[PDB]
PDB file of N, CA and C in Angstrom:
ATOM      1  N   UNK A   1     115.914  56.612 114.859  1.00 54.21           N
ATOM      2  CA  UNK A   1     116.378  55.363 114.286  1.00 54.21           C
ATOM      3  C   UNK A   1     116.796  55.492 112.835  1.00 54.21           C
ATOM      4  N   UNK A   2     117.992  55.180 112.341  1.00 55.01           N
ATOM      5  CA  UNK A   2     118.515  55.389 111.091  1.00 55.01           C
ATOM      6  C   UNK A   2     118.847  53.935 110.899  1.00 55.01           C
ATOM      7  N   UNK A   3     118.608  52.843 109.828  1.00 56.09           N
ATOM      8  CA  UNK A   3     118.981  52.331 109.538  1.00 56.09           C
ATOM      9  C   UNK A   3     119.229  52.341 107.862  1.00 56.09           C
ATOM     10  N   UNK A   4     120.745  51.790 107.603  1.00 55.30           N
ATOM     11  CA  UNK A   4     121.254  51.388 106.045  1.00 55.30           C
ATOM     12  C   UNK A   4     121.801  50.147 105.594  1.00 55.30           C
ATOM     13  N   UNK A   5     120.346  50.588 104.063  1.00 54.05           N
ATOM     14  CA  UNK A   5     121.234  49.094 103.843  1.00 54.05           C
ATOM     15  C   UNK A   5     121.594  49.584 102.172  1.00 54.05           C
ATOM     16  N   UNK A   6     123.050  48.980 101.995  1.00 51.74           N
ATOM     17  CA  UNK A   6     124.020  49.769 101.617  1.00 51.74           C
ATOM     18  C   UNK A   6     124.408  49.156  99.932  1.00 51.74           C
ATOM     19  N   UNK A   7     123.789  49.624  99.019  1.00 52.45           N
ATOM     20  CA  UNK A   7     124.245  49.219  97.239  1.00 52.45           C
ATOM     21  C   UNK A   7     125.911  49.454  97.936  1.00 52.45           C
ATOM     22  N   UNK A   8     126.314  48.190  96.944  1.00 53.25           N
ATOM     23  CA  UNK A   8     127.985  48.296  97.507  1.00 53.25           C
ATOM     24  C   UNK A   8     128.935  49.207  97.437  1.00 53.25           C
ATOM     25  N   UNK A   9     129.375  49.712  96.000  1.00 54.11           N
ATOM     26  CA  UNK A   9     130.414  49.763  95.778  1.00 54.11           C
ATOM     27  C   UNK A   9     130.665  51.467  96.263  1.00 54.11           C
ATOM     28  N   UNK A  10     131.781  51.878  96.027  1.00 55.27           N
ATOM     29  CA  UNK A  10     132.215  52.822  96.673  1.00 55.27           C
ATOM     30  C   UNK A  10     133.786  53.010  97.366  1.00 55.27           C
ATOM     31  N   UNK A  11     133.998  53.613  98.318  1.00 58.09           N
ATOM     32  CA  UNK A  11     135.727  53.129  98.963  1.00 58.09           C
ATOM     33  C   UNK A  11     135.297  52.511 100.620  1.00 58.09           C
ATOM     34  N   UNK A  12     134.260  53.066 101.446  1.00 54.84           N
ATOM     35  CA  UNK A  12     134.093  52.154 102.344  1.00 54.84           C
ATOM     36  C   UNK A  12     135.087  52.909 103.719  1.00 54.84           C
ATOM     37  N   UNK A  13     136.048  54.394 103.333  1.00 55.71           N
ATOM     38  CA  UNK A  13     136.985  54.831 103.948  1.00 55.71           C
ATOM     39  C   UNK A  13     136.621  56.202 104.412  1.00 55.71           C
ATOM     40  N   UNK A  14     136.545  56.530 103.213  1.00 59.17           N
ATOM     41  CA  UNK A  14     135.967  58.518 103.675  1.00 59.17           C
ATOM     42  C   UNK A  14     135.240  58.533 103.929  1.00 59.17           C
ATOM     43  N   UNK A  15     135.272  59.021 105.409  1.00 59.67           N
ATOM     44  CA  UNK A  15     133.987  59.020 105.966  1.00 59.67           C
ATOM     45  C   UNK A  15     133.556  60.656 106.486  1.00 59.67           C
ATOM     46  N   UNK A  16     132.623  60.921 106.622  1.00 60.27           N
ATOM     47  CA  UNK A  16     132.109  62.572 106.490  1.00 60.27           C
ATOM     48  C   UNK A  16     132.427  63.249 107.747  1.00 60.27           C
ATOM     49  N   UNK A  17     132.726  64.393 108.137  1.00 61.55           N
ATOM     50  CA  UNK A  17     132.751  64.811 109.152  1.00 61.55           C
ATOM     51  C   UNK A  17     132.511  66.381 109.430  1.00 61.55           C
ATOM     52  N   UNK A  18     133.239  66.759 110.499  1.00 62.83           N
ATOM     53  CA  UNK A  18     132.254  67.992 111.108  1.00 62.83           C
ATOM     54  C   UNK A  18     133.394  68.984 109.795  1.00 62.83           C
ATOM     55  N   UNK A  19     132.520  70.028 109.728  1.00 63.97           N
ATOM     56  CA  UNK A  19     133.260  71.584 108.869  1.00 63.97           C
ATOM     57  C   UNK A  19     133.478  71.131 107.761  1.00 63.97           C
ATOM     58  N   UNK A  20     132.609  70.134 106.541  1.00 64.33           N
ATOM     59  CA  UNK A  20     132.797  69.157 105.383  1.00 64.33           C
ATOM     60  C   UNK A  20     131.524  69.594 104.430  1.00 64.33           C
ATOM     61  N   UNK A  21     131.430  69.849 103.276  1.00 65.84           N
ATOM     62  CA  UNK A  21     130.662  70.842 102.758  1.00 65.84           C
ATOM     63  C   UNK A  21     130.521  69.429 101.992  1.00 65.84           C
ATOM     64  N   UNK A  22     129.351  68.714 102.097  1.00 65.48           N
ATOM     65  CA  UNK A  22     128.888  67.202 101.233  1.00 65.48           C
ATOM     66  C   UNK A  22     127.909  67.923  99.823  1.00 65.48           C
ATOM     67  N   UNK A  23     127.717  66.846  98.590  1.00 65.30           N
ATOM     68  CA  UNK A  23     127.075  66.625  98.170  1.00 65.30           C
ATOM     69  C   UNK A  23     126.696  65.523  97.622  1.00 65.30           C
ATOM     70  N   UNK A  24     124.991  65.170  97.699  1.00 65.59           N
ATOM     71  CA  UNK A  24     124.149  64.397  98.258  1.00 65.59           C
ATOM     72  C   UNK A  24     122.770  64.326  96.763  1.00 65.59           C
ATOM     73  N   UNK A  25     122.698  63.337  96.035  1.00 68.96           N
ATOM     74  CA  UNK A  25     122.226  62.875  94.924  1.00 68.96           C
ATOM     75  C   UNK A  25     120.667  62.879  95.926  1.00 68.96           C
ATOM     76  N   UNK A  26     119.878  63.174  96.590  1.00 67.01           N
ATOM     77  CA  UNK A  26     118.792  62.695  97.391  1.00 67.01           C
ATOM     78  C   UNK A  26     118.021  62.269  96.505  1.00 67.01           C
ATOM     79  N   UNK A  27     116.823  61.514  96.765  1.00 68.84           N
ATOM     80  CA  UNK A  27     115.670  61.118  96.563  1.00 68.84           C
ATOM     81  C   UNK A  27     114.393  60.909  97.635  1.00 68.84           C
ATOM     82  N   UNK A  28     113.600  61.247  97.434  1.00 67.69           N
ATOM     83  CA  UNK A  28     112.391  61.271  98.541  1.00 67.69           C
ATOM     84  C   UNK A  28     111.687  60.203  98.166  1.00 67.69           C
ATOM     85  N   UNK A  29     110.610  59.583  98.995  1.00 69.32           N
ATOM     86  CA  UNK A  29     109.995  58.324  98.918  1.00 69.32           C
ATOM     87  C   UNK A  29     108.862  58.178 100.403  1.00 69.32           C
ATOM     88  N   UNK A  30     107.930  58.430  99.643  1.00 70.89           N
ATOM     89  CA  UNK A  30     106.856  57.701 100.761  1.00 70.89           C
ATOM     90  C   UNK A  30     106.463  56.054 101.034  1.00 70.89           C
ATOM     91  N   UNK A  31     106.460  55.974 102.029  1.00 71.23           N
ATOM     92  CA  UNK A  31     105.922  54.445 102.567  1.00 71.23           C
ATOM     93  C   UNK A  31     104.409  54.201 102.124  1.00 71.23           C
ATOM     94  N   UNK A  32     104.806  53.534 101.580  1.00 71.93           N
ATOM     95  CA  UNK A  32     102.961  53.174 100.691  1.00 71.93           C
ATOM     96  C   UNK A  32     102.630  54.472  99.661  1.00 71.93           C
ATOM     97  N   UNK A  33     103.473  54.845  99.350  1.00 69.91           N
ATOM     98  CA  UNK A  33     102.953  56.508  98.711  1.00 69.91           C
ATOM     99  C   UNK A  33     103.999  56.664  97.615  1.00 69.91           C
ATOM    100  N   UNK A  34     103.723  57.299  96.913  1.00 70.80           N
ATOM    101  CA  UNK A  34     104.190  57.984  95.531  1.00 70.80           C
ATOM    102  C   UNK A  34     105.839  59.421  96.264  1.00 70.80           C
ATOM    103  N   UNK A  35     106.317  59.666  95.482  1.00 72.10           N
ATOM    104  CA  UNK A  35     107.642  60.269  95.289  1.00 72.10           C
ATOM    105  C   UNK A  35     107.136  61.721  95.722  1.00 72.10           C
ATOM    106  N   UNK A  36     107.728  62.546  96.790  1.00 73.18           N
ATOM    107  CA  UNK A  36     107.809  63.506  96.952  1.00 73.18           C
ATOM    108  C   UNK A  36     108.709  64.784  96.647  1.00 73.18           C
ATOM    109  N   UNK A  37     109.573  63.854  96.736  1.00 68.49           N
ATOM    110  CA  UNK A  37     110.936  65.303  96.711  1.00 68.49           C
ATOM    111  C   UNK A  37     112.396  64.405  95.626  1.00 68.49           C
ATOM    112  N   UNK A  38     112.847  65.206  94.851  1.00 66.95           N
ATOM    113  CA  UNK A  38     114.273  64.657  94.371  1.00 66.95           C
ATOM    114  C   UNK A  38     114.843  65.814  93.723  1.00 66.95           C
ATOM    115  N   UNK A  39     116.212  65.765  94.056  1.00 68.39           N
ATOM    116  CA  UNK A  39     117.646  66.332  93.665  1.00 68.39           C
ATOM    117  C   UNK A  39     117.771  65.962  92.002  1.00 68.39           C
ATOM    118  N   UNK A  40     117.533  65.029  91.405  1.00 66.95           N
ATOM    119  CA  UNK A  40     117.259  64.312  89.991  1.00 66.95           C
ATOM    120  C   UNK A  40     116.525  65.031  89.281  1.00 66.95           C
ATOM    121  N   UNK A  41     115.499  65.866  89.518  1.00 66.25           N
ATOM    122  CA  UNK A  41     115.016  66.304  88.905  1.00 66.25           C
ATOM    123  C   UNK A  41     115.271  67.642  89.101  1.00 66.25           C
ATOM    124  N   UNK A  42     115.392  68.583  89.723  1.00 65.66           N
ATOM    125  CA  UNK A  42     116.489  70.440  89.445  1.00 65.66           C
ATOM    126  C   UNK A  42     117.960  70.219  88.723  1.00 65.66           C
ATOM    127  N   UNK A  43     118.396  68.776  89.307  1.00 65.62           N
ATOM    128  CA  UNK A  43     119.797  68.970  88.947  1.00 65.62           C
ATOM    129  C   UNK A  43     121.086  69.158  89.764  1.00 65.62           C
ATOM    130  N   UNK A  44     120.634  69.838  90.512  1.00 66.96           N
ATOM    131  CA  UNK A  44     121.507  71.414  91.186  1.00 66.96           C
ATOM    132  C   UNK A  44     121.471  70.611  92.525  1.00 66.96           C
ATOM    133  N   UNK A  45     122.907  69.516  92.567  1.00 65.30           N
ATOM    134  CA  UNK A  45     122.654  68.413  93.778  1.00 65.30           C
ATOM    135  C   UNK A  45     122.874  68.471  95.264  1.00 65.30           C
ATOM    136  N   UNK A  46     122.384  69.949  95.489  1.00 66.68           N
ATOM    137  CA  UNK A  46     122.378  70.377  97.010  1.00 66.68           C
ATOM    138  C   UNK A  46     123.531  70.167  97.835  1.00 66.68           C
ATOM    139  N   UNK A  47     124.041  71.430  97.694  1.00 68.69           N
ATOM    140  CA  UNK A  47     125.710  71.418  97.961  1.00 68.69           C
ATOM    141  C   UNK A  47     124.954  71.902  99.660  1.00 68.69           C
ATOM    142  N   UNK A  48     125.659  71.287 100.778  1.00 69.09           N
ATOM    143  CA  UNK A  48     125.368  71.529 102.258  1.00 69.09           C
ATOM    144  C   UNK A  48     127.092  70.657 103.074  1.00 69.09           C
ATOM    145  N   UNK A  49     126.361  71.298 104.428  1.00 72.07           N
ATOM    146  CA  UNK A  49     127.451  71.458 105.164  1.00 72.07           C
ATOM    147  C   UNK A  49     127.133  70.370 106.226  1.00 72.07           C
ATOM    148  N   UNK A  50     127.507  69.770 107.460  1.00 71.98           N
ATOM    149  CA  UNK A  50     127.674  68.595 108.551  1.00 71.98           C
ATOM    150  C   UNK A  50     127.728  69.960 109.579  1.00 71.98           C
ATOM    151  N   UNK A  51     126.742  69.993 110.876  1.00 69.93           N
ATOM    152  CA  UNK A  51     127.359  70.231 111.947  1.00 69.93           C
ATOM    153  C   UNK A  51     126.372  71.593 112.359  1.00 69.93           C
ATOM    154  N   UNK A  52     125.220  71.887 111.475  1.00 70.17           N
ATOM    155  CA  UNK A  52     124.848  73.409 111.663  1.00 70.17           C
ATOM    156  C   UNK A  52     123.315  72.835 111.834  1.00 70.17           C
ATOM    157  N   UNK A  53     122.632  71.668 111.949  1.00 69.53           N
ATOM    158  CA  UNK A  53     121.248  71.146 111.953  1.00 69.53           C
ATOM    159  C   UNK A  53     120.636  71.523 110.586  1.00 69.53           C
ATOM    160  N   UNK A  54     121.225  71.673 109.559  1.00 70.27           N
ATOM    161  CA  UNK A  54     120.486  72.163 108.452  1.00 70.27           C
ATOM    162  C   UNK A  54     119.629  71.244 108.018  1.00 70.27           C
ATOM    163  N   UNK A  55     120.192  70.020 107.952  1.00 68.80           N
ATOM    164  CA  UNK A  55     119.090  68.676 107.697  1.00 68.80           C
ATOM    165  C   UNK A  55     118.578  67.936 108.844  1.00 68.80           C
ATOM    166  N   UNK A  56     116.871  67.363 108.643  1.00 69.77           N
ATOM    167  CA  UNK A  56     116.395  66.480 109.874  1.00 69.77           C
ATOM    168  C   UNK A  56     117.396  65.669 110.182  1.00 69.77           C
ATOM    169  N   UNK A  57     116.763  65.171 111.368  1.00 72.19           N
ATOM    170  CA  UNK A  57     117.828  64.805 112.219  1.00 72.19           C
ATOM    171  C   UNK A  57     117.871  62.799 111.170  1.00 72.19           C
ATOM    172  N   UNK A  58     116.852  62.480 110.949  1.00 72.89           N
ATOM    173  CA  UNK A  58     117.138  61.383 110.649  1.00 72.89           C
ATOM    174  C   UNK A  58     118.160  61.136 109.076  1.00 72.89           C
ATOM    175  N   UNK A  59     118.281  62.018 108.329  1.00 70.35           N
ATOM    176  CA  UNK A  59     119.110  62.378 107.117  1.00 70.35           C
ATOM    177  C   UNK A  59     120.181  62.725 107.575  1.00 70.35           C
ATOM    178  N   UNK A  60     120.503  63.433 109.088  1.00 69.50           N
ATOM    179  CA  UNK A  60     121.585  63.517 109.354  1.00 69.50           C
ATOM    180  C   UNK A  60     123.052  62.871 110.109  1.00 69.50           C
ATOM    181  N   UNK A  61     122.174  61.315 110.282  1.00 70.37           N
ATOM    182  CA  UNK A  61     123.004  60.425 111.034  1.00 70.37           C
ATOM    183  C   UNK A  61     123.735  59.521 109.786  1.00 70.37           C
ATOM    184  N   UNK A  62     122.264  59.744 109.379  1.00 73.43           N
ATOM    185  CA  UNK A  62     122.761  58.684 107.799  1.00 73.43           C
ATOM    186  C   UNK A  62     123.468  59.292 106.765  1.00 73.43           C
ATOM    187  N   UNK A  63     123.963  60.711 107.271  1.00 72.43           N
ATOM    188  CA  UNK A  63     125.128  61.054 105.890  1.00 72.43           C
ATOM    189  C   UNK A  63     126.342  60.148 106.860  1.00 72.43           C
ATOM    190  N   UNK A  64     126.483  60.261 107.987  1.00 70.93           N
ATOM    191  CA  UNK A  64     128.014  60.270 108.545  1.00 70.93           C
ATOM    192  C   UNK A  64     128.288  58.607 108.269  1.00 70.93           C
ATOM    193  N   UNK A  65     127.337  57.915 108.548  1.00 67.35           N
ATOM    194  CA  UNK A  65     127.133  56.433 107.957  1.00 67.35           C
ATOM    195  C   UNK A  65     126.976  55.922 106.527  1.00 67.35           C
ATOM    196  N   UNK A  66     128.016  56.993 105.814  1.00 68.29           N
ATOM    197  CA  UNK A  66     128.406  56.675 104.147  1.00 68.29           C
ATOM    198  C   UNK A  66     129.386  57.099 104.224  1.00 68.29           C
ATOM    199  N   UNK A  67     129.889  56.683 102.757  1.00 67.51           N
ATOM    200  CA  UNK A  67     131.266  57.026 102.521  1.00 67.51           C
ATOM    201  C   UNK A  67     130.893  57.384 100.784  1.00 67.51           C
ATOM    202  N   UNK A  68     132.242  57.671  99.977  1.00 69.12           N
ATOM    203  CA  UNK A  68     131.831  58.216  98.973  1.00 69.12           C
ATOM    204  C   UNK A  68     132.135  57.228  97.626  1.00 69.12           C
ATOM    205  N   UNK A  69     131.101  57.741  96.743  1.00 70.07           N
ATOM    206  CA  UNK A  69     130.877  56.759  95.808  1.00 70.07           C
ATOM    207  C   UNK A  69     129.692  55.554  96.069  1.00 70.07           C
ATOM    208  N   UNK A  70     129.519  55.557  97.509  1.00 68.64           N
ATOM    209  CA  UNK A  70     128.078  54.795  98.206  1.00 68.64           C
ATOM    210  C   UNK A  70     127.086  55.268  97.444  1.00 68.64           C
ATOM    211  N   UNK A  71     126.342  53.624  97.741  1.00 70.30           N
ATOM    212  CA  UNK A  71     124.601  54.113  97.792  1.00 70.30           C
ATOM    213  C   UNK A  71     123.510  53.937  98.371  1.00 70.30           C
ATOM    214  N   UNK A  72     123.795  53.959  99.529  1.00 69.83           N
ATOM    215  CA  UNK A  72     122.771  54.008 100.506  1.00 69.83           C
ATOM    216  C   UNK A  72     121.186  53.835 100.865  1.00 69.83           C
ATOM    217  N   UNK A  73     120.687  53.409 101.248  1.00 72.69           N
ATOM    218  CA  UNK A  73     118.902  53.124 101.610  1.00 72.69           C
ATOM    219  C   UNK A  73     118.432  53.716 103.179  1.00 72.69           C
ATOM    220  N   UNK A  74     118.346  55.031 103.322  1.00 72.43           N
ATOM    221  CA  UNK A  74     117.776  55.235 104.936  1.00 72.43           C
ATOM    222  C   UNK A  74     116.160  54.872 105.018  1.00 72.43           C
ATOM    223  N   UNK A  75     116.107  55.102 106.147  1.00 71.37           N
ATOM    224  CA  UNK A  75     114.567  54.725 106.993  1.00 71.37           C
ATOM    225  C   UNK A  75     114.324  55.318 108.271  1.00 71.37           C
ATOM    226  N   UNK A  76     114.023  56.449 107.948  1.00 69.55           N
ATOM    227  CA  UNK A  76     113.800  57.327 109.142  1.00 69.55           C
ATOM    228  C   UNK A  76     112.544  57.241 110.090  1.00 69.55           C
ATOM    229  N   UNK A  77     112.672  57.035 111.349  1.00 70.88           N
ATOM    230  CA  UNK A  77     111.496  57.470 112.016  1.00 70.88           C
ATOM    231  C   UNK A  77     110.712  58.699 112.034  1.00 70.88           C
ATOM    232  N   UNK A  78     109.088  58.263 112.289  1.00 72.59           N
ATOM    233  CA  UNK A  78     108.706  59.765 112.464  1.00 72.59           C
ATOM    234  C   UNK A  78     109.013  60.924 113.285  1.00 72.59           C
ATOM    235  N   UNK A  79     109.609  60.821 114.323  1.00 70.92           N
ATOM    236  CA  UNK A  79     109.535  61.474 115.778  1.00 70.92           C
ATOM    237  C   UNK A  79     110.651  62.580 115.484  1.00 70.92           C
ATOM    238  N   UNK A  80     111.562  61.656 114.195  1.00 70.36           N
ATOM    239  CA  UNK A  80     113.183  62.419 114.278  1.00 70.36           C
ATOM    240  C   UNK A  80     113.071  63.555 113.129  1.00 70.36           C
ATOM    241  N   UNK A  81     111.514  63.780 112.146  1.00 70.68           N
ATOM    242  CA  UNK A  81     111.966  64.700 111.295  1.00 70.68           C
ATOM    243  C   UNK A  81     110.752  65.327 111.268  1.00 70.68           C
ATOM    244  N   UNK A  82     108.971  64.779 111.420  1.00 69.67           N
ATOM    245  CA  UNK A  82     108.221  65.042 111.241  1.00 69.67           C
ATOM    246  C   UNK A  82     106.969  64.891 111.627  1.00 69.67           C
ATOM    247  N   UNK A  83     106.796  63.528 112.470  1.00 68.50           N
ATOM    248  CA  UNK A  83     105.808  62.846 112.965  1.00 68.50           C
ATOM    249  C   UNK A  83     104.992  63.651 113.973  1.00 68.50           C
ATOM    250  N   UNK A  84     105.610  63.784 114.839  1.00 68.41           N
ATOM    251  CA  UNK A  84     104.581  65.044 115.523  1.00 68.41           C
ATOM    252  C   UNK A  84     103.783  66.147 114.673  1.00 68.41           C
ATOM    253  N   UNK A  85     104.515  67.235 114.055  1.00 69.59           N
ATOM    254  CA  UNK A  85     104.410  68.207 113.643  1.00 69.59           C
ATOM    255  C   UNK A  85     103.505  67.707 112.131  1.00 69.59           C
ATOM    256  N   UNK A  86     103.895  67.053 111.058  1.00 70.30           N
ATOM    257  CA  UNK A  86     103.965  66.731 109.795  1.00 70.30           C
ATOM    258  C   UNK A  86     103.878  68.811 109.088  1.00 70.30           C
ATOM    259  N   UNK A  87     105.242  68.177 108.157  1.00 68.78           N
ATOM    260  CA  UNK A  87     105.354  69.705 107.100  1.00 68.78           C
ATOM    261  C   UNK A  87     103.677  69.890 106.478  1.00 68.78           C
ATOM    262  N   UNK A  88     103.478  71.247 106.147  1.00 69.12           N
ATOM    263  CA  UNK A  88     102.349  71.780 105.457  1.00 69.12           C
ATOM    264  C   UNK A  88     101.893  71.283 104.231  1.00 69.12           C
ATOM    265  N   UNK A  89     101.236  70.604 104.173  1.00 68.83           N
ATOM    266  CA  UNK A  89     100.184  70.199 102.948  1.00 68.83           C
ATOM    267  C   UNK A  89     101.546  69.477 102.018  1.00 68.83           C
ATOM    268  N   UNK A  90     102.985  68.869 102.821  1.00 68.05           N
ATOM    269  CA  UNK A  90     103.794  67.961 101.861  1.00 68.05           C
ATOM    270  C   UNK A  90     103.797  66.676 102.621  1.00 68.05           C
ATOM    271  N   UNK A  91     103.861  67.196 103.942  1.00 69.94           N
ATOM    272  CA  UNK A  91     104.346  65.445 104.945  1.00 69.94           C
ATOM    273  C   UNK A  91     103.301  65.614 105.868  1.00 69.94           C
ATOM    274  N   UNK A  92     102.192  64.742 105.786  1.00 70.73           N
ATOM    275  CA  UNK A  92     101.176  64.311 106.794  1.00 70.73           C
ATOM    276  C   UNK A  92     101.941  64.117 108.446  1.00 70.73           C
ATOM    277  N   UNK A  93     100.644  64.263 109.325  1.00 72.66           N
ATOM    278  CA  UNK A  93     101.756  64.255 110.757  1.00 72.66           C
ATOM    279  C   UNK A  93     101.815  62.550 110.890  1.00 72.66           C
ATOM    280  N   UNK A  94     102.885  62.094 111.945  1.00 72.15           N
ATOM    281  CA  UNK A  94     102.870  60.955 111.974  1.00 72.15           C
ATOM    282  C   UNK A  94     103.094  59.651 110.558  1.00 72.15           C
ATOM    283  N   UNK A  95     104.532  60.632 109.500  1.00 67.46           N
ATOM    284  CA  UNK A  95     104.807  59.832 108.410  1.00 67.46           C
ATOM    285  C   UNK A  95     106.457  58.789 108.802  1.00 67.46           C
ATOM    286  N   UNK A  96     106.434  57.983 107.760  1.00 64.62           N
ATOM    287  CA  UNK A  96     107.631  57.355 108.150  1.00 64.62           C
ATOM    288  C   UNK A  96     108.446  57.595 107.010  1.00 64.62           C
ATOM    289  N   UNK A  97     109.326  57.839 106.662  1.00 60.93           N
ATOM    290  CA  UNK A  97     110.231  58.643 105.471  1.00 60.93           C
ATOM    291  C   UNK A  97     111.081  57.508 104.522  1.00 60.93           C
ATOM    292  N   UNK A  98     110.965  57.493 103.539  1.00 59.99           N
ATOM    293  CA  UNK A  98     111.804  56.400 102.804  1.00 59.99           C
ATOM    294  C   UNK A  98     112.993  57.134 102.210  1.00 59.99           C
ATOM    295  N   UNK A  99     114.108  57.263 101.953  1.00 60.56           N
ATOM    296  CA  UNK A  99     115.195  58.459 101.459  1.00 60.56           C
ATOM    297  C   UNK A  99     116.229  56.910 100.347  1.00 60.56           C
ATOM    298  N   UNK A 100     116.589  57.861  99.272  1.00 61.08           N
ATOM    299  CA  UNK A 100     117.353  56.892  98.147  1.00 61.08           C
ATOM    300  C   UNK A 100     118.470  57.981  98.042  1.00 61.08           C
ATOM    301  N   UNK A 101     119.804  57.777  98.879  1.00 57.50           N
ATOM    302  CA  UNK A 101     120.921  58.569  98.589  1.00 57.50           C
ATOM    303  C   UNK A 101     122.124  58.248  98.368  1.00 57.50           C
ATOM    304  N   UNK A 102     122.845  58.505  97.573  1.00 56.54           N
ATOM    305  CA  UNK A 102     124.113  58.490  96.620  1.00 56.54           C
ATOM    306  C   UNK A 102     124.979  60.141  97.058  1.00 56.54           C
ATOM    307  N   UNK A 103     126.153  59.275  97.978  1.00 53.45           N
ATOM    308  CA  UNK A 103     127.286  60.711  98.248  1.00 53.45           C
ATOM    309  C   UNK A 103     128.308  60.316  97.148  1.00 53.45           C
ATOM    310  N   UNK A 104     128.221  61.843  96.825  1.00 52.42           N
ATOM    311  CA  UNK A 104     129.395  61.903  95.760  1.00 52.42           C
ATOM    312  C   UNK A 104     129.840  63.444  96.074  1.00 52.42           C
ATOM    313  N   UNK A 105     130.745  63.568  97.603  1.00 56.08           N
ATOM    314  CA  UNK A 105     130.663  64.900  97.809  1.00 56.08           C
ATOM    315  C   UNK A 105     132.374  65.342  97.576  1.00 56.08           C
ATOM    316  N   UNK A 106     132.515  66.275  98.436  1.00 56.88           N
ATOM    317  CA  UNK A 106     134.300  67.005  98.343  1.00 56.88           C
ATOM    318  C   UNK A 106     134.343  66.842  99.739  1.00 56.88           C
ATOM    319  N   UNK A 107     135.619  67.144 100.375  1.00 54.41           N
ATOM    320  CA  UNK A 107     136.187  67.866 101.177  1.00 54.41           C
ATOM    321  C   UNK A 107     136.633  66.706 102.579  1.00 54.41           C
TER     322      UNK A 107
END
């Protein structure tokens, strides 16, 4: 389940697609919980590609559901990135993911 709800401005046109090398302002966010992960703070705004599973699956519906200059609000389920499994001593099993992302990519 991906849902967005969408800071406006932006073009509303380019929309992302397969063999498209994005970059992606991320922010991490726990539900009831303090900040895990952000792009804001290295800098270095994670230049990636559409089409190879490199990102969970719930980050990955919600790039194609932006356009550029967006700013986006996802809400990922557990099942689609982590909930079963939960990552090692970062994502408890059975978490629900809060994500704060801004595309400002090429191609």
């Amino acid at each position: 389940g991906v849902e967005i709800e969408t800071i406006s401005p932006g073009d509303g046109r380019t929309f992302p697609k397969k063999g498209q090398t994005c970059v992606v302002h991320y922010t991490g966010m726990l539900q009831n919980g303090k900040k895990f992960d952000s792009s804001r703070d290295r800098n270095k705004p994670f230049k990636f590609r559409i089409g190879k599973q490199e990102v969970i699956k719930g980050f990955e519906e919600g790039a194609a559901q932006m356009s550029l200059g967006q700013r986006a609000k996802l809400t990922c389920t557990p099942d689609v990135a982590y909930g079963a499994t939960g990552h090692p001593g970062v994502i408890p099993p059975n978490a629900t993911l809060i994500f704060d992302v801004e595309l400002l990519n090429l191609e």
